[PDB]
Amino acid sequence: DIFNRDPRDHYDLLQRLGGGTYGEVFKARDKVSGDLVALKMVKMEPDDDVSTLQKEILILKTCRHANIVAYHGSYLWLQKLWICMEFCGAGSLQDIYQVTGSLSELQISYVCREVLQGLAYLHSQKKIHRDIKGANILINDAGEVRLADFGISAQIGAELARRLEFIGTPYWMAPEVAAVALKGGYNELCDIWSLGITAIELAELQPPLFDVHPLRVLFLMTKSGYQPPRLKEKGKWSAAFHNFIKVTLTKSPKKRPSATKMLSHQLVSQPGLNRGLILDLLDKLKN
Numbered sequence: 112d113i114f115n116r117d118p119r120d121h122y123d124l125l126q127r128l129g130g131g132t133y134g135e136v137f138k139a140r141d142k143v144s145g146d147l148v149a150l151k152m153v154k155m156e157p158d159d160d161v162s163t164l165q166k167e168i169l170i171l172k173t174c175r176h177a178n179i180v181a182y183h184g185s186y187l188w189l190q191k192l193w194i195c196m197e198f199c200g201a202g203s204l205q206d207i208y209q210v211t212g213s214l215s216e217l218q219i220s221y222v223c224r225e226v227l228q229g230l231a232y233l234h235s236q237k238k239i240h241r242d243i244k245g246a247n248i249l250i251n252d253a254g255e256v257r258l259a260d261f262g263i264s265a266q267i268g269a270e271l272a273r274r275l276e277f278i279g280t281p282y283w284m285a286p287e288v289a290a291v292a293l294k295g296g297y298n299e300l301c302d303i304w305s306l307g308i309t310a311i312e313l314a315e316l317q318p319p320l321f322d323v324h325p326l327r328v329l330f331l332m333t334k335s336g337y338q339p340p341r342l343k344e345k346g347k348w349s350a351a352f353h354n355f356i357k358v359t360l361t362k363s364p365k366k367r368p369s370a371t372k373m374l375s376h377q378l379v380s381q382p383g384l385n386r387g388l389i390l391d392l393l394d395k396l397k398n
């Protein structure tokens with residue numbers, strides 16, 4: 112399950128794909144088969160013991176869904192944990208929309224249906240993703256949509272920095288999460304709000320209030336009179352898209368619909384939503 116060797120023994124490391132609080136991701140090629148993979152490297156600390164690593168690796172290996180990037184294996188070498196996973200050729204939806212411009216309503220509908228399928232699985236497994244945003248939803252060359260990981264709980268190494276990162280960038284978090292370090296707590300329905308913000312992000316190239324200082328956003332979003340965000344151009348979008356934003360962005364978590372409930376919403380249960388819509392989007396990259 113966890114190899115005691117340098118990942119360089121089995122893989123040719125190619126370009127750095129990106130990074131963040133979750134670690135550094137590299138594109139790699141299997142030396143024998145020639146197949147491409149992604150390797151995420153995380154620096155281990157004196158508290159990351161192998162018993163805890165073993166426990167978290169078994170969860171990484173058993174949490175499997177078609178809409179979540181598949182785990183392939185792992186290596187622990189010179190205080191660095193490397194996680195081998197499926198390679199998503201087109202990168203994240205953020206990498207895509209920062210070239211193509213805004214996604215169409217149908218493209219957003221398909222992405223939301225695919226993400227809701229992933230979230231419904233994670234929630235049935237008593238997990239909360241807590242990291243839904245365009246940069247964390249990956250696309251392969253076939254137009255398939257996959258969550259980069261199962262969220263903040265998939266983090267082995269530097270978990271606290273990743274868990275607290277939203278405080279400096281809270282734009283995608285539900286009001287109940289933004290009320291950090293207060294009595295409230297939250298549940299899996301915070302993921303539904305984050306999916307609603309993400310649908311705005313794909314339509315507008317940034318989440319609502321992205322230009323506002325993160326500490327002012329935390330302050331406003333948790334005020335009693337906070338009005339949940341809306342799409343900026345009423346006319347460009349249909350009544351179904353406006354309603355999907357209205358219900359996913361319900362301020363009270365006790366009134367917000369579940370991932371399974373959202374899967375029957377008119378926007379995501381409509382005919383013709385398939386990977387072909389994202390193949391059309393990836394063709395825009397060529398020009």
Ligand SMILES: Cn1cnc2c(-c3cnc(Nc4ccc(N5CCOCC5)cc4)c(C(N)=O)n3)cccc21
Pocket residue numbers: 128129133136148149151180196197198199200201202203206246247249259260
């Ligand atoms: C939280 N979080 C966010 N991202 C991840 C990832 C992660 C990140 N990037 C990936 N690939 C990738 C990135 C960029 C591009 N370019 C294409 C051409 O335009 C420029 C961008 C291509 C592929 C992959 C993967 N599996 O392939 N995974 C892994 C783990 C956690 C994560």
